[PDB]
Design an enzyme around this catalytic site. Sequence first.
Site, PDB file in Angstrom:
ATOM      1  N   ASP A  95       0.828  -1.390   0.021  1.00  0.00           N
ATOM      2  CA  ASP A  95      -0.155  -0.109   0.017  1.00  0.00           C
ATOM      3  C   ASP A  95       0.862   1.272   0.069  1.00  0.00           C
ATOM      4  OD1 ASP A  95       0.983   0.004   2.557  1.00  0.00           O
ATOM      5  OD2 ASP A  95      -0.883   0.343   3.528  1.00  0.00           O
ATOM      6  N   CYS A  98       4.719  -0.520   2.998  1.00  0.00           N
ATOM      7  CA  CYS A  98       5.400  -1.692   3.085  1.00  0.00           C
ATOM      8  C   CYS A  98       6.661  -1.844   3.737  1.00  0.00           C
ATOM      9  CB  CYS A  98       5.165  -2.525   1.638  1.00  0.00           C
ATOM     10  SG  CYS A  98       5.817  -1.822   0.412  1.00  0.00           S
ATOM     11  N   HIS A 223       8.414  -3.915  -3.656  1.00  0.00           N
ATOM     12  CA  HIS A 223       7.602  -4.266  -2.665  1.00  0.00           C
ATOM     13  C   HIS A 223       8.543  -4.684  -1.606  1.00  0.00           C
ATOM     14  CE1 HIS A 223       4.428  -6.063  -0.303  1.00  0.00           C
ATOM     15  NE2 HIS A 223       4.640  -7.299  -0.713  1.00  0.00           N
TER      16      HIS A 223
END
Lengths: 323, 322
Positions: A95, A98, A223
């Site tokens: 989001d 992370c 990520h």
Amino acid sequence: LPQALYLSNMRKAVKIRERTPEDIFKPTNGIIHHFKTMHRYTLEMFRTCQFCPQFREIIHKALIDRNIQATLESQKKLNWCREVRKLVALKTNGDGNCLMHATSQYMWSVQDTDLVLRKALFSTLKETDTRNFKFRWQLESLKSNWNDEWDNLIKMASTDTPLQYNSLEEIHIFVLCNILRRPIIVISDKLRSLKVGGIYLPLHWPAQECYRYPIVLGYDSHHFVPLVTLKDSGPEIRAVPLVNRDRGRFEDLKVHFLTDPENEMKEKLLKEYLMVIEIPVQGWDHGTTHLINAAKLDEANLPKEINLVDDYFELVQHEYKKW
Amino acid sequence: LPQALYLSNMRKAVKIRERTPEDIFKPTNGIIHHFKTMHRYTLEMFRTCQFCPQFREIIHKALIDRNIQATLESQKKLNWCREVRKLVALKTNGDGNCLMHATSQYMWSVQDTDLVLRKALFSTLKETDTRNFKFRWQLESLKSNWNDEWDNLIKMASTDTPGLQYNSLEEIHIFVLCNILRRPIIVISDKMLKVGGIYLPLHWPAQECYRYPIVLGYDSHHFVPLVTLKDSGPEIRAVPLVNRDRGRFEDLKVHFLTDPENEMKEKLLKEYLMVIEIPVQGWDHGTTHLINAAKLDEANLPKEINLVDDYFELVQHEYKKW
Ligand SMILES: [Cl-]
Ligand SMILES: [Cl-]
């Protein structure tokens, strides 16, 4: 079985998060705010192979980011030493917060869903002297309008929508490891034959005031995830390599934001903040054995009362006895 | 906030259900198998106001069966009496085991997902003494293939698959269940299958029974628990033992009584329940009437085995961050 970690005990998740901001101390002499105690916690993951393929599957699809796991392993970047215990990647919300979710999870088995870590970062950046940080950052920026770019990096740290949140970068990791007083090591996707990855040390504290086991994160496709140690016993050792294989040789992980004298005594510096060991590994020239540096990893210490993985494990047992 | 109730603390829910089978005492001498202690627990729902309607809507969507609430309220069966506390219907899986699910929720804040209550019921009907039960059922049926009919009622209680995951249950199953729990069950529906009514544990002397009822709601082949709301005095903590019906009060049905038991209905009610006589408004506004009502238990589920207190701590946490 629950479809994600946090679902195993939402009540306990909230209790954990509510301890965190009360563990934060804010100095008044300009010293960075930092955690008093909780920074010392470390999660270990339980072994799933004691089950059957269909059961493994559900466990893995719930807890494990198998995409990142596989990408980092297939590059010989994760789990490549035969001597050392396997690390597994846990799913993490993508989001924009992370880095904070992965870090929060490694220590506490919950994500940063109250933005406590995110707010601590924005706070330091917005409301103290950051001169040294900026200086170290300028140095790194030139190794590979200063005021305009610095202002933006701080703005990136806010809880403002720009993905729900602005993604974060290297300097943010660096500030964060200084708020935790604990090193962070990032293992990232990247072949030399054809920047986030590396070691972040809490250099605004003396090593004696710091926790000397790393938080270990994976990074791929923009990520972050935690890479937590798999419980086993034994006889492999808990360690993360401080170098990568590069074809026939080795390439030291990047140590971020060092000043010039620090970089001159890099090996010494690493040996202060981490517990550096030597590990024999098969050579990829005619050699057959070379010693490489690795850092010792913490043993599970997150008490059950604040461990979602314990509760998760116990659901797994219950649901398995019923076969 | 959690989509359902069990999601609040999945681990605590497992522990609750784990306690259930070991609380069952299993006599050899032919007396029915029953619970030693856990039948005395009661859940209450927490007050859902002091919150703003987007969050009140979040909670009710999550926990309350509003369709069945609205249904039983409009037909004037549920919450008709302005003198007693409001009861709320909690969501219940409709898999065919919902009699047990609803009953399990009322006492323990969990559903019968491990089939502990279901199995106990079948184990009674298939491995013990069912003479007196079959007799009461015959008596009740004839008030309007007797060996075969009885035989399938015993099979319905099994965990066999029938179009729901389980066979549906009926009045006689409710009556047996109340004797395993040694605790009355009162069902509110739109009759008051004529499932509505009062089920007393007549295979036990009242002295060995818990005298607060489990209260269920029933509509469209679906059972839900009807739990009291927590902080809602000064209203009376009680369920009425009559309904308004066309200008009079009519007693709820009491099920499976023998003839001599039926000649002393009021006496039986007063032994198995805590009956109180309360005033309510009449149809002439110049007039008040006395009716019987049965006292409802206070919330006694310890936090360590209460999903509802965890849900509430979650709710509280979320409200401050809003
Ligand atoms: Cl009234
Ligand atoms: Cl009327």
